[PDB]
């Protein structure tokens, strides 16, 4: 089994046999191929999930502070 890495992270400029999905013809596929493809839920890489809970926590506190 290959690593479970989404093809959203592959290069959008390589010599892919299938440019739309970023795949070469006989390449091995992870068993989770259905949901690793270009038409699958997106991976957001702006911040780590732990830090986001903090920042959305800060917005909530300020909103409560304005309410108070």
């Amino acid at each position: 089994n290959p690593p479970r890495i989404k093809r959203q992270f592959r290069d959008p400029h390589a010599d892919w046999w299938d440019k739309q999905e970023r795949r070469n013809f006989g390449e091995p596929v992870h068993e989770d191929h259905d949901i690793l493809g270009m038409f699958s839920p997106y991976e957001y890489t702006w911040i780590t999930p732990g830090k986001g809970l903090f920042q959305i926590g800060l917005f909530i506190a300020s909103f409560l502070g304005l309410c108070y």
């Binding site: 596929v29 068993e31 191929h33």
Partner: protein, 73 residues
């Protein structure tokens, strides 16, 4: 049967499907599989059944007006 059109059958994808169709031959009883096999089959349906038992005929909204109560029991 009928001859189909030419398909670039992918050696990779064919064996992926051949993996899935034959997958069950390799399932084993481990500590991990029992945990999932116990939660989905027993806990979650038992939990649903308990709520279904305790709320049976508990509430009726039919014709109920103000001054009357939704609870039937």
């Amino acid at each position: 049967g009928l001859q189909h059109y030419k398909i670039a059958m992918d050696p990779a994808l064919v064996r992926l499907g051949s993996m899935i169709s034959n997958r069950y031959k390799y399932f084993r009883w481990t500590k991990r599989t029992a945990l999932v096999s116990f939660m989905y089959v027993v806990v979650v349906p038992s939990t649903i059944g308990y709520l279904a038992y305790k709320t049976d005929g508990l509430w009726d909204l039919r014709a109920k007006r103000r001054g009357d109560l939704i609870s039937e029991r």
